[PDB]
From Swiss-Prot:
Record PTM text: A cleavage occurs, separating the extracellular domain from the transmembrane segment. This process called 'ectodomain shedding' is thought to be involved in receptor desensitization, signal transduction and/or membrane localization.
Gene that produces this protein: Ptprd
Compartment list: Membrane
Domain (Fibronectin type-III) ranges: 5-95, 100-191
Tissues expressing the protein: Brain, kidney, heart, and some B-cell lines.
Origin species: Mus musculus (Mouse)
Subunit record text: Interacts with PPFIA1, PPFIA2 and PPFIA3. Interacts (via extracellular domain) with SLITRK4 (via LRR 1 and 2 repeats). Interacts with SLITRK2; induces presynaptic differentiation. Interacts (via the second immunoglobilin domain) with IL1RAPL1 (via the first immunoglobilin domain); induces pre- and postsynaptic differentiation of neurons and synapse formation. Isoform G, isoform H, isoform I, isoform J, and isoform K do not interact with IL1RAPL1.
Sequence similarity: Belongs to the protein-tyrosine phosphatase family. Receptor class 2A subfamily.
Residue range from the parent sequence: 321 to 511 of 1912
Protein name, UniProt field: Receptor-type tyrosine-protein phosphatase delta
Top-rank taxon: Eukaryota
Task of the protein: Can bidirectionally induce pre- and post-synaptic differentiation of neurons by mediating interaction with IL1RAP and IL1RAPL1 trans-synaptically. Involved in pre-synaptic differentiation through interaction with SLITRK2.
Length: 193
């Protein structure tokens, strides 16, 4: 007869871009192979299908970081294709952001304070936990020797105690739990009233 549905698949490995599934055959007799059905959790469209999986374990790659996914497994034998299992829900791991905060802007508020603001990076790869604002009077320095101000998840901050009539270079990165993303390319702001 046709195969019965495989056992509900179990996620046993995950990375930022892959999910590894294992399942029970769900069947008394041997199965020829399996088909994995996968989609984003909140897609309302039909599952995509990976055909011809010859074992009861498979890693689905390259998915995107910090994303919700739905999977099912289908068994096939010589008679044909059985019903899909019950779905499993899961989520790929986070990464550091892989793009810079966008539209980074700064303007003078006084001779000693500026206003810095930006937009969220397009590629956060995770929950943004905060931003780090780098600023200096000498941008030839390594960024780790610039002055630094840490911020929570936000898009605007003020920075004070600046020396008047100076060009300050400013760079901003976002960070997730995993790590720091890239720095925006330098902008300049002058402490001139």
């Amino acid at each position: 007869a046709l195969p019965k549905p495989p056992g509900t698949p179990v996620v046993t490995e995950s990375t930022a871009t892959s999910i590894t599934l294992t399942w029970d055959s769900g069947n008394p007799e041997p199965v020829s192979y399996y088909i994995i059905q996968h989609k984003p959790k909140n897609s309302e469209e039909p599952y995509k299908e990976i055909d011809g999986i010859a074992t009861t374990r498979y890693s689905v790659a390259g998915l995107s970081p910090y994303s919700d996914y739905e999977f099912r497994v289908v068994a096939v034998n010589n008679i044909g294709r059985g019903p899909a299992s019950e779905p499993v829900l899961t989520q790929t791991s986070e990464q550091a952001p892989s793009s810079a905060p966008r539209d980074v802007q700064a303007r003078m508020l006084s001779s000693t304070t500026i206003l810095v603001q930006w937009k969220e990076p397009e590629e956060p790869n995770g929950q943004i936990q905060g931003y780090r604002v780098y600023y200096t009077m000498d941008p030839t320095q390594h960024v780790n020797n610039w002055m630094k101000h840490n911020v929570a998840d936000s898009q605007i901050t003020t920075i004070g105690n600046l020396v008047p009539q100076k060009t300050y270079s400013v760079k901003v990165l976002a960070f997730t739990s995993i790590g720091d993303g890239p720095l925006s390319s330098d902008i300049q702001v002058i402490t001139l009233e």
